[PDB]
Structures are given as C-alpha cells and as structure tokens.
Write a protein that binds this ligand. Structure first.
Ligand SMILES: [Mg+2]
Ligand SMILES: [Mg+2]
Ligand SMILES: [Mg+2]
Ligand SMILES: [Mg+2]
Ligand SMILES: [Mg+2]
Ligand SMILES: [Mg+2]
Ligand SMILES: [Mg+2]
Ligand SMILES: [Mg+2]
Ligand SMILES: [Mg+2]
Ligand SMILES: [Mg+2]
Ligand SMILES: [Mg+2]
Ligand SMILES: [Mg+2]
Ligand SMILES: [Mg+2]
Ligand SMILES: [Mg+2]
Ligand SMILES: [Mg+2]
Ligand SMILES: [Mg+2]
Ligand SMILES: [Mg+2]
Ligand SMILES: [Mg+2]
Ligand SMILES: [Mg+2]
Ligand SMILES: [Mg+2]
Ligand SMILES: [Mg+2]
Ligand SMILES: [Mg+2]
Ligand SMILES: [Mg+2]
Ligand SMILES: [Mg+2]
Ligand SMILES: [Mg+2]
Ligand SMILES: [Mg+2]
Ligand SMILES: [Mg+2]
Ligand SMILES: [Mg+2]
Ligand SMILES: [Mg+2]
Ligand SMILES: [Mg+2]
Ligand SMILES: [Mg+2]
Ligand SMILES: [Mg+2]
Ligand SMILES: [Mg+2]
Ligand SMILES: [Mg+2]
Ligand SMILES: [Mg+2]
Ligand SMILES: [Mg+2]
Ligand SMILES: [Mg+2]
Ligand SMILES: [Mg+2]
Ligand SMILES: [Mg+2]
Ligand SMILES: [Mg+2]
Ligand SMILES: [Mg+2]
Ligand SMILES: [Mg+2]
Ligand SMILES: [Mg+2]
Ligand SMILES: [Mg+2]
Ligand SMILES: [Mg+2]
Ligand SMILES: [Mg+2]
Ligand SMILES: [Mg+2]
Ligand SMILES: [Mg+2]
Ligand SMILES: [Mg+2]
Ligand SMILES: [Mg+2]
Ligand SMILES: [Mg+2]
Ligand SMILES: [Mg+2]
Ligand SMILES: [Mg+2]
Ligand SMILES: [Mg+2]
Ligand SMILES: [Mg+2]
Ligand SMILES: [Mg+2]
Ligand SMILES: [Mg+2]
Ligand SMILES: [Mg+2]
Ligand SMILES: [Mg+2]
Ligand SMILES: [Mg+2]
Ligand SMILES: [Mg+2]
Ligand SMILES: [Mg+2]
Ligand SMILES: [Mg+2]
Ligand SMILES: [Mg+2]
Ligand SMILES: [Mg+2]
Ligand SMILES: [Mg+2]
Ligand SMILES: [Mg+2]
Ligand SMILES: [Mg+2]
Ligand SMILES: [Mg+2]
Ligand SMILES: [Mg+2]
Ligand SMILES: [Mg+2]
Ligand SMILES: [Mg+2]
Ligand SMILES: [Mg+2]
Ligand SMILES: [Mg+2]
Ligand SMILES: [Mg+2]
Length: 127
RNA sequence: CGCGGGGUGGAGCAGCCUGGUAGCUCGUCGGGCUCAUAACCCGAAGGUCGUCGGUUCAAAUCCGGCCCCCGCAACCA
RNA sequence: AAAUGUAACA
RNA sequence: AGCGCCGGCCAACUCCGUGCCAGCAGCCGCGGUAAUACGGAGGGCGCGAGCGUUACCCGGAUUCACUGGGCGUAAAGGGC
RNA sequence: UGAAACUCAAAGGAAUUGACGGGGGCCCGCACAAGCGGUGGAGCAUGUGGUUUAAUUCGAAGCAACGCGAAGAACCUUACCAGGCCUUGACAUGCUAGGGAACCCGGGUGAAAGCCUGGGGUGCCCCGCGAGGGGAGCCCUAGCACAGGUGCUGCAUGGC
RNA sequence: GGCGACACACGUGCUACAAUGCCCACUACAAAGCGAUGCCACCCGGCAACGGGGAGCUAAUCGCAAAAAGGUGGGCCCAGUUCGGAUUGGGGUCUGCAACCCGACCCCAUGAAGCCGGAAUCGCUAGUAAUCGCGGAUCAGCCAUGCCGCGGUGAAUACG
RNA sequence: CCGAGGGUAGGGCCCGUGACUGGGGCGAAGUCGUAACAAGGUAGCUGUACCGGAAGGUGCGGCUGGAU
C-alpha cells in the first residue's frame, strides 16, 4: 500500500538522469550548485544507485555552472522526480567581502530514460 | 555507380611511402603564486591506430573485403 | 609591459 | 453607528501569527524566526450618517518667475 | 531645425573627511638586501581538507584556522554510534500523602546499568514501670510544580 | 564501538641522508624545578624493561640525578655502510577492573625510504641563530617528536 | 440657370495594420574582454576620417575639464 506513492508515474523505474544547474547569484550559487551535486551523489550511494557522472562544466570563479548525473539504479526515477524543483539556498555567503547574508538558487531537474531511437523504417505501404 | 584521398588519446594534427621506436599543441589531473579566480611556474597521467581477417620472425605502417568521411566525375542524344 | 571579484553595510 | 488611520511626513503602540513568503506602498521604503510598516487582536488617534478610494482642477510649484527665476563649473551664450 | 512613446528617483555643481593609486616627498619594522640554519623531496609523529563509516561528535578558515580549544581520547573523558535500561529523573527549591527514617550487609537475574529481594538497631521534647502518640532531623514510595539539554542563534549578548 | 578509518590532499614538527660523522669504553662542567597509597639512596635477581628487599627525606638536609654536546682512548674507512631506524616476526615488563580495536618500555630478529630535496617558502641582528641536553604542568599509564621553562657550547652578516 | 447628392478620374493629409528589419529602455544570475574614474597602468575629452568581436584604436587639428 506504500506503492501507491511510487507505482503511479508511468515509468518510475527507468535509470533516470539528474540535471543540476546554477542560478541567481553566480559564484555563490555555483558553489551551492557543487554542494548540491555532492548532496545527491552521497544520497545515491546510500541507496544502492550508481553514481555515474555524464557531463560537467566547472564555474570560472569557484564551483559548478551545471552537471548531469546518471542515477543508474532501481526505481530511481520515483525517488528523484519528487526532487525536481528550484532549490533556493538562503545562506550566509563567503564570497562577499564584509560577510553579508545572501541568497543564491540552483535547480535540480529529473527525467527518465527512453528508447531515443529516431530511425523510422520506410515501408512501401505508404509511399 | 566510377576514379583517389582519408579514419591514429578528450579536441585538432604528425607518424606510413624506405615495417620493429606512436609525437606536437590545447586540454585533463596533483602541486605552487594570489585574499581569490584567470594568466604564469613545477611535476604527472593519457591512444582496441574504424572494423574482420593476415604479410612477416614482427604491422599504426604492407596487401584484400566490408563500414562510415571528404573531393572529383556522371557526357552525346 | 601585467586581466578580473556579481547578488542582502546595520 | 459606522469608516479611515496609528513607521517618518502625520495624531495614534503593544501582544501574537508570519519569516523577502503571504502581503503593504502616495513618496522614502517595509517583510530573510522579538516586524510600532504584512495579517488578526487589545488599545489608541481622526471624523461621524457618514468615512475612505479612484478621476479631474487650482494650490503648495518663485517648478514658465508680470508681481516673482535663471545661463563660468549644476539645464542654459548663438562659432564670429 | 528637432520631438514622442517608454523609463528612472535621481542625473547633477562645489566643497569636507577618509580610503586608494602600476602619484610624489620624508621616514620605520628580519620587509628586502647581506648572511646562517631550515621547510617544500624521504620515513615517521601530529592537526586539518577530503573520503569512508553505524558513528568516524563539535568548533577553529588568508595573514590573525590547521602539535589551535585538547597542560594527557584504552574504559572514564565523550558531547557521536549500536544495543540494554530509568521517568520528579544523575542534580536544586517546593507542597502534599504512605513506610520506616537515617547507615551499613549480602542473595537472584544481567555485559553492566537496571529490575527483583533477603538482612538488621533512628536519636529527640515527649503520656513513656504500659501497648501506644508524634515532630522533624534523613532516606524510601506515589504525585504535582519543576529539573535536565555540549539542541539552534557569537548576526540578539556579557565576559575573556 | 567510534573520536585512532585511508585511493588521496595541505599545514606544523621529529629523525635523517653521514667522517666537523657513527659506535664502544672511561672521564668532567649546569640551571631551573619537582617529590609522603610521593621522590627513591644502597643491596640482590634478571642481558634488560623491571622485580624483590630496604635507609633517607614534612625536604638549601634526603631523592629524582646521569646532565648532553665536551674531554681522553679504541673501533669504523666512504659503501645505502658499524649511515638511517621505518616496517614486520618472536619473546617479555609495567600501569590499569581491562592494553583486540587502541598504551608506553625492554630484548632477539628483521634493517625500508632516504646520496641533501621542483616550483615555491620560513626563522633569526648577539649570548641571537645553530646545536646540546635538563625540568615541569596535564598525568594510573601514555601514544610529548607538542607546550611552557632551564641552562651548556656558541657563530655569520647588515653596502644600502 | 443654379442646385442636395450620386458617378468617373487624379492628388493631399491623418490613423490603424504588415513578412521582415533597425536601434532603444528595464534586469538580483550568463559569455567575452576591461574603455573611463589614480599618470586607471597608452593623460583624458573632443569634431572629423578610416578601421576593428566589443568596449574602442589610429591619423589631423583643437581644449585642460591633465598627474608628475
Ligand atoms: Mg560534347
Ligand atoms: Mg486617514
Ligand atoms: Mg522599525
Ligand atoms: Mg495628516
Ligand atoms: Mg507620531
Ligand atoms: Mg508562508
Ligand atoms: Mg494597509
Ligand atoms: Mg530577525
Ligand atoms: Mg515575531
Ligand atoms: Mg516575551
Ligand atoms: Mg503604515
Ligand atoms: Mg500591523
Ligand atoms: Mg451630516
Ligand atoms: Mg467623498
Ligand atoms: Mg498641482
Ligand atoms: Mg505658479
Ligand atoms: Mg521676472
Ligand atoms: Mg532657477
Ligand atoms: Mg558636464
Ligand atoms: Mg554643461
Ligand atoms: Mg562666445
Ligand atoms: Mg549648433
Ligand atoms: Mg567633486
Ligand atoms: Mg580630497
Ligand atoms: Mg602610496
Ligand atoms: Mg621577515
Ligand atoms: Mg632573505
Ligand atoms: Mg636559503
Ligand atoms: Mg624540506
Ligand atoms: Mg614532509
Ligand atoms: Mg581530494
Ligand atoms: Mg567541525
Ligand atoms: Mg574538527
Ligand atoms: Mg596561525
Ligand atoms: Mg592529549
Ligand atoms: Mg587500548
Ligand atoms: Mg567514550
Ligand atoms: Mg558514556
Ligand atoms: Mg562578535
Ligand atoms: Mg562563528
Ligand atoms: Mg563579545
Ligand atoms: Mg572509546
Ligand atoms: Mg580529535
Ligand atoms: Mg587508527
Ligand atoms: Mg604532499
Ligand atoms: Mg612538514
Ligand atoms: Mg610532531
Ligand atoms: Mg629539524
Ligand atoms: Mg637496505
Ligand atoms: Mg643499518
Ligand atoms: Mg632507494
Ligand atoms: Mg653516501
Ligand atoms: Mg635544504
Ligand atoms: Mg643537514
Ligand atoms: Mg623558488
Ligand atoms: Mg630586531
Ligand atoms: Mg644532531
Ligand atoms: Mg623534556
Ligand atoms: Mg611532574
Ligand atoms: Mg605525565
Ligand atoms: Mg599510537
Ligand atoms: Mg446643371
Ligand atoms: Mg455641383
Ligand atoms: Mg460634388
Ligand atoms: Mg442623386
Ligand atoms: Mg524588434
Ligand atoms: Mg583610453
Ligand atoms: Mg583601464
Ligand atoms: Mg588610459
Ligand atoms: Mg579622434
Ligand atoms: Mg566592421
Ligand atoms: Mg573576430
Ligand atoms: Mg588600427
Ligand atoms: Mg591629438
Ligand atoms: Mg581653438
């Protein structure tokens, strides 16, 4: 009866991908973006998933502008689709000189895996 | 369909022709300089040589077949 | 001869 | 007997809820876990069969200056 | 010659105090230079970042964090983790009601804690040759107030 | 049980890479401190850690205590060595209720890296640096190569 | 005859609208470089001309509202 939470979402079993992005703020949020990939990596290890990093791009001041991880595991999309959203991080900021309290956002978008095959065969019934 | 040129680390190229030895640049990784990043400095890692087969003692290299890439040609009615 | 430092100063 | 208001201008202050959200806002600005500025309450101030809002006119605006302004550097001397 | 839509709550002049300048002048400090010995390489000790972990408690973050809080982590310390337990409780001030107070000595179970339990005599001022009747010395049991928290905020603070 | 983890990364230190050195034996010269379930003379057993005896000292009295470099002699002969002392095997001691994780010390055996360190970087202007040992706080014991002190020997250089 | 108006033709002005295109204003965050403010690291500004991803550069002349 607890698989009315996860058995309701078409494909809540495909090896999903996590698409994390920096955002408002910049350096601070790129720091927070790298913090948030670490957060989901340690998450996925403590849950039997495979921590499979497909594409990075590190930020130029300090941190990550964007990342994509393959959460290669079982039922992975069910758990991480309820992680889709923009994660605000209100926090206290280290890149601002006089130590001011700042807000910086970064997102986490989550999708499953499809066939990704666009090789439709030409059949003489319709030519 | 024809002719002839290519495929070699993450990227772009060199290496073949006169076989044994795969190099350069950028990147990547560890260290330094800086308050910090870039730049720079020191050290390091990195290639089934498109595949099948095989020339030879030995193939990235030589010779066939296939597979993608590039150029040219495809005329006279 | 040598670049840059965003976004919340009581 | 109701309506507006109680951060400054501008008269009237506390408690709770909230926690850059929900919202306020005429200007300056309020709200990121002790908010007299948001929402409710208690209390208070101002009017009263009215109280506020929007629109428009004059005023404040000597901010088109007749009364009554300016032009080196603030906007402003025409190139002669 | 010369607009408007739209937009902002300013754009501005001069002067002041700072701060800064790959501006200047004059000075100082093992700042450089002059030297001598090191670190960075090795093995080890130690702290830290990470990573790992059930936990590898927590803080310190350029100089001015990193043999720093730690001038002594095997248990204790210990604030973390796992497991076994306790509920006015390891500790304060209470008020109320039952036991006997008070203190020492063993038995069972158990890793220990804890749970269970068998021992034994309470002064006082007192009716006491008498059963018996306390008060409050301190403990035990049941309550209700309360305790307790190295849980957060050093960006609410004092102190250092 | 963990704070002691370990593909890695940085800071602080210890010991070194040797001949101005290492080892053995003998022999000198300090200061500041600490010490009554404490400091332990001296004796004996053990190669030893240590153990068993046992005097003294509320300590300018007695004890820790030997200071070490140094000095005098002997060995080593330039080698990864009589340098270096990591790592590991085995056997023991002591503290402690208890040394698996996770103690210090002794003995036999083993005897690693390291041939003076890239970019870079630290300290010190005189009894200083360098080097040598001694004490204490904490403390059952100790992971102290740390810290706070103490004295011994004792430089180089500063144009600017 | 004139004449409301209707019709034919041609102009003028104004408004709405149009594939596409030019630049402009706003922005809590992006990319590239760092032109100006200190002599801003090539003094700055300027009219003009040519040029360049971009701020901008250079020529000619001018101003000081230019440090030493
Ligand atoms: Mg022809
Ligand atoms: Mg009102
Ligand atoms: Mg206020
Ligand atoms: Mg008023
Ligand atoms: Mg008032
Ligand atoms: Mg809300
Ligand atoms: Mg309101
Ligand atoms: Mg607050
Ligand atoms: Mg509140
Ligand atoms: Mg209160
Ligand atoms: Mg108001
Ligand atoms: Mg209110
Ligand atoms: Mg009336
Ligand atoms: Mg009205
Ligand atoms: Mg008006
Ligand atoms: Mg008027
Ligand atoms: Mg006038
Ligand atoms: Mg005027
Ligand atoms: Mg002007
Ligand atoms: Mg002007
Ligand atoms: Mg004139
Ligand atoms: Mg003109
Ligand atoms: Mg001025
Ligand atoms: Mg001034
Ligand atoms: Mg200066
Ligand atoms: Mg210095
Ligand atoms: Mg020097
Ligand atoms: Mg040197
Ligand atoms: Mg070194
Ligand atoms: Mg080292
Ligand atoms: Mg790392
Ligand atoms: Mg911490
Ligand atoms: Mg810590
Ligand atoms: Mg420090
Ligand atoms: Mg310690
Ligand atoms: Mg132990
Ligand atoms: Mg413990
Ligand atoms: Mg405990
Ligand atoms: Mg403070
Ligand atoms: Mg803090
Ligand atoms: Mg304070
Ligand atoms: Mg422990
Ligand atoms: Mg620790
Ligand atoms: Mg360990
Ligand atoms: Mg290192
Ligand atoms: Mg070190
Ligand atoms: Mg050390
Ligand atoms: Mg040393
Ligand atoms: Mg050897
Ligand atoms: Mg040896
Ligand atoms: Mg070697
Ligand atoms: Mg040698
Ligand atoms: Mg050296
Ligand atoms: Mg040396
Ligand atoms: Mg250097
Ligand atoms: Mg000095
Ligand atoms: Mg020495
Ligand atoms: Mg010592
Ligand atoms: Mg002592
Ligand atoms: Mg001790
Ligand atoms: Mg140890
Ligand atoms: Mg007619
Ligand atoms: Mg007519
Ligand atoms: Mg007509
Ligand atoms: Mg008609
Ligand atoms: Mg447009
Ligand atoms: Mg310029
Ligand atoms: Mg500039
Ligand atoms: Mg300039
Ligand atoms: Mg020009
Ligand atoms: Mg152009
Ligand atoms: Mg270009
Ligand atoms: Mg040019
Ligand atoms: Mg000129
Ligand atoms: Mg002129």
């Amino acid at each position: 009866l607890e698989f009315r939470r996860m058995f309701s979402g078409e494909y809540d079993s495909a090896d999903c991908y996590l698409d994390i992005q920096a955002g408002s703020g910049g350096t601070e949020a790129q720091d927070w973006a790298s913090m948030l990939e670490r957060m989901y990596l340690r998450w996925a290890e403590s849950r039997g998933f495979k921590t499979e990093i497909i594409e990075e791009s590190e930020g130029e001041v300090a941190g990550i502008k964007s990342v994509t991880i393959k959460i290669s595991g079982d039922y992975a999309y069910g758990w991480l689709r309820t992680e889709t959203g923009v994660h605000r991080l209100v926090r206290k900021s280290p890149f601002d000189s006089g130590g001011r309290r700042h807000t910086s956002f970064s997102s986490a978008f989550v999708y499953p895996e499809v066939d990704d095959d666009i090789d439709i065969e030409i059949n003489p019934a319709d030519l």
